[PDB]
C-alpha cells in the first residue's frame, strides 16, 4: 500500500497540486445527485409515471418490448453519486481476487474457428508513435507521471518504451525513466432510484506512454476490423442491426437466440482468457516489433500497479484493467472464441451472425440452450448470473437495445433503445453543469443525443412530444436560430469511440439524426 515520498515521486512528477486535489476528491467522494432542468418541478417518479401511461399502448403488439422497458425502468435514477474511496475498496479487490477462480483452458478448435473469420486479412503492422499520438484523444488526462493534458506533455513522453519488470511497470519517456501506475478513476452507472443505488465503476486511467504503445496495435486493429465488418458494433448500430437481421433469418426455425451477460467481466478476465487474446493478436500481427509488443506491452493492462490514493499503490496481476486502450479489443476477440467453443462443444457450428462486444453477447447455433452456454462459458473462471440471461426464438437484447424478428424498418430488425432508460438520463446526469456557466445550448445538445437512441422505437414520435414538454425551450425549437445552425452548435459542444477502445462511457452528422429531422418537421 503506502509508499514513502521518494518512491511516490518516481511514479508522479512532484509537486502535483492537481493530482493531490484529485485524490482528495477520491477520498471524500461526491454525494450530490445531479438533476437536470428536464421537467423541472416534477419528480423523477412522476416523469416516468406519466410517460408510462402512453407507453403501455405497445404492450399488446410488442409485450416483450414492454418487458424490456419495465426491466430498464427499475434502474432509472441517479448516476452522479460517487462513494468515498473507503467504500470502494472491495470493488478494487475484485480485480485481483476474481482472476483465481477455477478455470479450464479454451478448446483448440474454438481458437482456430475464430482465427478462420479473418483468413484472408492483411496482417497488422504497428503504427508509429507519432501517428498513434496524432489520432488519439489529446485533451484527456496523461495519467502517471504528469497527470496533465496529453497535448501538453507529448514531448516529455515520446519516444517511449514500457514493460513489466516483475511487479513494476518500467517506463522510459524521452530519455527519463518513471515507474508506471494506473490512477483510480470512477464512473457512475444508474442502478435504481436511490442515491445509494448508483453503480460504482472502477476506471483504470493508464499512463499516457502505456496507452500510446497499446494503441500502436489497437488503432490499426480497430480500423481493419471496421472495414471488414467483423465486429459490427465497432462500425455503427445500423451494422449491428443488419447482422441481427441475418441472424434471425438464418437461425434454425425452432432454435432459441441466447443473450448472455457477464457479471464483472473485466475482473474475471484472468490469465487463461489473456493468453487466448495474445494468441489471436499474434495471428493478426506480423513482424518483429509485434513480437516485441506481444511480450512487453500486451501484458501491462493485466498487471500494471494501481495508484488508488495519494500515498498508496497496489501491485500484482489482476483482471482487465477497465480503461485500457485494448479494453474492448482483447475482450471482444476472446468473447468470440467463447461463442465458437459453445457450438463446438455440442458438435455444431456457430451461426456467424452471432455478435459480441466486451461483456455483452447474443448468439445462436443448432440446438443451443442457455444452460449449455452458461456451462461452456463459466468453466473458464467467468461469473454469470442466470436472471440476467435471456432466451427467446423471436427477440433479443444487445447493447441495451431490443430487437425482434418481426419488428422491421426497411427490411431490417432495428434495435429499440428504452424510452424509460432515456428518460432517466434526460432527468439525471453524472456531472454538474452550472446553468449560469454552460448555457442552454449545451444542455439541449445533451438531450438530443440521448433521445436519438430511440430513433426506431414504435412510440418515438409520442416520446419526442413528451420530451419537448419538459424542456423550457423545447429541444431547440425555442432557441432562436439553433436548429438552423445545429451543425455549428454541435461543434462548439465537443459512445462508439468507447465501444472500440477504453470502456468508460457505458460530428455535424447531427443534421442527419432522426431527432433533428423530427424537430424540424415540428416547426
Numbering used by the authors: 1 to 494, 500 to 511, 518 to 534
Task: Please give me the paper's original passages concerning this structure.
Picobirnaviruses (PBV) are small, non-enveloped dsRNA viruses infecting a wide range of mammalian and avian species. Human PBV (hPBV) has been identified on almost every continent, and has been associated with acute gastroenteritis primarily in children and people that are immunocompromised. It has a bi-segmented genome with the genome segment two (PBV2) encoding the viral RdRP and the genome segment one (PBV1) encoding the CP and a protein of unknown function.
The purified hPBV RdRP (534 aa, ~62 kDa with a N-terminal 6xHis tag) exists in solution as a monomer, based on its gel filtration chromatography elution profile. hPBV RdRP was crystallized in the space group of P21 with two molecules in each asymmetric unit. The palm subdomain hosts the three key aspartic acid residues, D261, D359, and D360, of the active site. This loop structure, which is associated with higher than average temperature factor values, extends from the C-terminal domain towards the catalytic site. In this model, the 3’-end of the template collides with the hPBV insertion loop structure, suggesting that the insertion loop in its current position would sterically prevent the template from binding to the active site of the RdRP as expected in the assembly of a productive initiation complex (right). Therefore, the hPBV insertion loop structure must undergo a significant conformational change in order for RNA binding and replication to take place.
